Amino acid sequence: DVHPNNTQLWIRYIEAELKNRNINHARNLLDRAVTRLPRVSKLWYKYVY
Amino acid sequence: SPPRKLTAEDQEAWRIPPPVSMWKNPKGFTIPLDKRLAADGRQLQEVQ
Amino acid sequence: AYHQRLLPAYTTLKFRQPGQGGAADKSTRDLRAELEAAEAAHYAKLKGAPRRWDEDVVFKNQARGTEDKGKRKEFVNDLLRSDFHKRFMSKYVR
Amino acid sequence: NMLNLLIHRKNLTYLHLDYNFNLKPVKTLTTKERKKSRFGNAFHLMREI
Amino acid sequence: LLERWLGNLLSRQFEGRHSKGVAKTVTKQRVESHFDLELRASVMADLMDMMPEGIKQSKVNTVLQHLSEAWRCWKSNIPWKVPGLPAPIENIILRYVKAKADWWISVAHYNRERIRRGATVDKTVAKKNVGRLTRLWLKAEQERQHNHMKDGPYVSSEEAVAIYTTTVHWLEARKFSPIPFPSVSYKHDTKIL
RNA sequence: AGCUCUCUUUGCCUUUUGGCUUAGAUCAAGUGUAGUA
RNA sequence: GCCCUUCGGGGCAUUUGGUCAAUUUGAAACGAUACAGAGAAGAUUAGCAUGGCCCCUGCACUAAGGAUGACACGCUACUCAAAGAGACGCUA
RNA sequence: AAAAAAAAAAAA
């Protein structure tokens, strides 16, 4: 809410969701991240990886 | 739009040097005297 | 709700009465014609179209070329070099 | 009674309002007590009226 | 008046103080501070609009420190030139330093005119104005000395020879004896001392 | 060729000087001895 | 109670009140006392701002004060690699 | 032809 378009915060929150084996939460998070920032290739690359 | 392609030339062209203040040291740093006189333009004066 | 503490003041708005212009619209071609007519009138007004005692003195004619100040007023966009600042500093620092 | 109630609600009970509307400290005031007890022009104007 | 005042008093007594959130006006004691705020924001805004998309935009307050350094160099008549600084950033800094200089000189002129008129009884304002015109006069004096170094002696050689010759002929016509060096055997050294 | 070990190199900024005004303004200091045993 | 009456009957007037009086157990605030002691890289200090789940005094929620009112001084891996050798050894 | 508060005296 304070930093909507920060790619680093999105990456760390998807990573923190993934390292606790919350797969569906993190996939929803990656959908939100590629919806908000469709022109950041880092988020798309992480999502396909 | 898709991001503009940045060369290393641009990344070095927009490098800002650190301010060598010859009035203020708010953190009490012992700056070398070499750096203290770099921004002083009196060394770039033609005595003609 | 709101949090303001204005006392009432100037509680009626003034409107442009007849003769004050404003809420009366013309075509922009008419505005161009009026602008060019007024500009042409102002430019035409600018163009006008409708023993000798002083013999032993060492230095002579040293004041020639002094009255030539004021041929045209030159605004200089450097405050420390303008005529206003030089007059200020010559007046106040002696 | 209104001035006395306003004084007592603000817990300034070291100020005494006598019946001729004089406000005097009953003791010696500290700096914090002097800063808390400093009334304004509305209270004092109403008191003098 | 008194009923509005007592209503405000009872409002602070029974629903509290709205201390935070209101816009304070820019009174005299705030003017310079307000100026600094606005100027910094303007400079900062220009920086965010000159950064190319992809540059590391964290250390950009470094430019605000460079702006402070450039203003300090302007006040001391020291030529400010940072080697390796990018040209658009240097242009932004020079542009806003000249705007601050224009404001500073205008305020100095206004305060001097108030002091001459007798319209000011503040002492710190007067001492500030004396300092500002001291700096302005020293900048003008440095420029005058540098101009005399560049443009040569303004007295022409013919003018100086004429002045010297007139002095020689006058002092010869007056039978003037040149003043000697103070001798060791001078009998008036003690009283002059 | 790849994987690992140590070292070097490149990239690396990783915490890598919150403002303003009359450089905000000013600013020496006790003492310090011992003819004769 | 009164009024009207063709003594059959009818009329006028119509629902108050967020209150137990009852102070330990439905919520006040200190001071004294002890203690600590006023910011800017030597010492001494005038200040003006900035941010808000910090306020106080004030009519000022478009003054001015409260030590420049206080507070801030912390903490610090993560958008994150590539090389060219040599090498206990791996391995083709 | 006759004008009379604050800065500023500091957080168990």
The rounded radius of gyration (Å) of the Cα atoms in chain A is 10
Helix A7-18, helix A41-48: angle, nearest 10: 10
* Tokens describing residue E129: 């104005």
Q: Going by C-beta distance under 8 Å and a sequence separation of 6 or more, which residues neighbour residue A13? A: A29
Under 8 Å between Cβ of E44 and E67: no
* Resolution reading in Å: 2.9
Method: cryo-EM
Strand G closer than 7 A to residue D26 Cβ: no
Task: Report how far apart, in Å, the C-alpha atoms of A49 and of each of A28, A42, A46 are.
Answer: 15, 10, 5
Under 8 Å between Cβ of B33 and E72: no
Decide: residue C73, CB within 10 A, 0-12 exposed, 13-18 middle, 19+ buried: exposed
Q: Nearest residue of E to residue D43 by CA position?
A: E6
Under 8 Å between Cβ of E82 and E66: yes
Q: What is the DSSP string of E8-50?
A: HHHHHHHH----SSPPPP--GGGHHHHHHHHHHHHHHHHHHHH
Give the H or E element holding residue D25.
strand D23-25
Strand G closer than 7 A to residue E12 Cβ: yes
CA-nearest of D13, B11, B35, C14 to E82 is B35
E111 CB neighbour count, 10 Å cutoff: 19
A-facing residues of B in 1-20 (CB < 8 A) are 1-3
CA-nearest of E71, E67, E73 to E90 is E67
- SS3 readout for B1-47: CCCCCCCHHHHHHCCCCCCCCCCCCCCCCCCCHHHHCCCEHHHHCCC
- Strand F neighbours with CB under 7 A? B 11, 18-21, 23-29, 31; E 32-33, 36, 40, 56, 58-59, 61, 64-65, 68, 71-72, 75, 104, 124, 127-128, 131-132, 135
Q: Going by C-beta distance under 8 Å and a sequence separation of 6 or more, which residues neighbour residue D43? A: D3, D6, E9
Q: Going by C-beta distance under 8 Å and a sequence separation of 6 or more, which residues neighbour residue E60? A: B16, E44, E47, E48, E51
Decide: residue E61, CB within 10 A, 0-12 exposed, 13-18 middle, 19+ buried: middle
Q: Which residues of E touch C85 (CB under 8 A)?
A: 105, 109, 136
- What is d(CA E183, CA E193) in angstroms, rounded to the nearest whole number? 14
Q: Do D42 and E2 touch (CB under 8 A)?
A: yes
CA-nearest of B42, B31, B13, B32 to E84 is B13
Task: Please report the sign of the dihedral spanned by the C-alpha atoms of residue C90, residue E103, residue E138, residue C65.
Answer: negative
Torsion of Cα atoms, E32 then E36 then E37 then E41, to 10°: 150
Under 8 Å between Cβ of E65 and B21: yes
Which amino acid does the sequence have at D38? R
Helix E87-117, helix C83-92: angle, nearest 10: 40
- What is d(CA E80, CA E85) in angstroms, rounded to the nearest whole number? 11
Q: Which nucleotide is nearest to E64 (CA to C1')?
A: F19
Under 8 Å between Cβ of A9 and A3: yes
Considering only CA atoms, name the residue closest to the C1' of nucleotide G58: D40
**CA E144 from centre of chain:** 17
**CA E177 from centre of chain:** 50
Measured in degrees and rounded to the nearest 5, phi and psi for residue E24 equal -80, 145
Q: Going by C-beta distance under 8 Å and a sequence separation of 6 or more, which residues neighbour residue D40? A: E9
DSSP 8-state code for residue B40: B
* Tokens describing residue C80: 């420390």
Under 8 Å between Cβ of E100 and E117: no
E98 CB neighbour count, 10 Å cutoff: 15
Q: Which nucleotide is nearest to D38 (CA to C1')?
A: G57
CA–CA min distance E90, chain B (Å): 10
Question: How far is it between the farthest Cα atoms of chain C?
Answer: 97
Q: Which nucleotide is nearest to D34 (CA to C1')?
A: G57
Under 8 Å between Cβ of D23 and D16: yes
Measured in degrees and rounded to the nearest 5, phi and psi for residue C63 equal -95, 0
- What is d(CA E135, CA E143) in angstroms, rounded to the nearest whole number? 12
The CB-side HSE value for D18 (13 A sphere, CA atoms) comes to 5
Task: Report how far apart, in Å, the C-alpha atoms of D25 and of each of D30, D31, E114 are.
Answer: 11, 13, 46
Torsion of Cα atoms, E71 then E75 then E79 then E82, to 10°: -20
C79 CB neighbour count, 10 Å cutoff: 17
DSSP 8-state code for residue D37: S
Give the H or E element holding residue C33.
helix C28-47
- What is d(CA A43, CA A11) in angstroms, rounded to the nearest whole number? 7
Under DSSP, is residue D23 helix (H, G, I), strand (E, B) or coil? strand
Task: Report how far apart, in Å, the C-alpha atoms of A3 and of each of A6, A9, A12, A26, B1 are.
Answer: 6, 8, 13, 18, 21
Q: Which residue is it, tokens 């009490």?
A: B28
- What is d(CA C78, CA C82) in angstroms, rounded to the nearest whole number? 6
Q: Do E9 and D40 touch (CB under 8 A)?
A: yes
Q: Going by C-beta distance under 8 Å and a sequence separation of 6 or more, which residues neighbour residue E48? A: E57, E60
Q: Do B16 and E51 touch (CB under 8 A)?
A: no
Give the H or E element holding residue D17.
strand D15-17
End-to-end CA distance of chain A: 26
- Distance H7 C1' – E92 CA (angstroms): 40
* Tokens describing residue D41: 């022009």
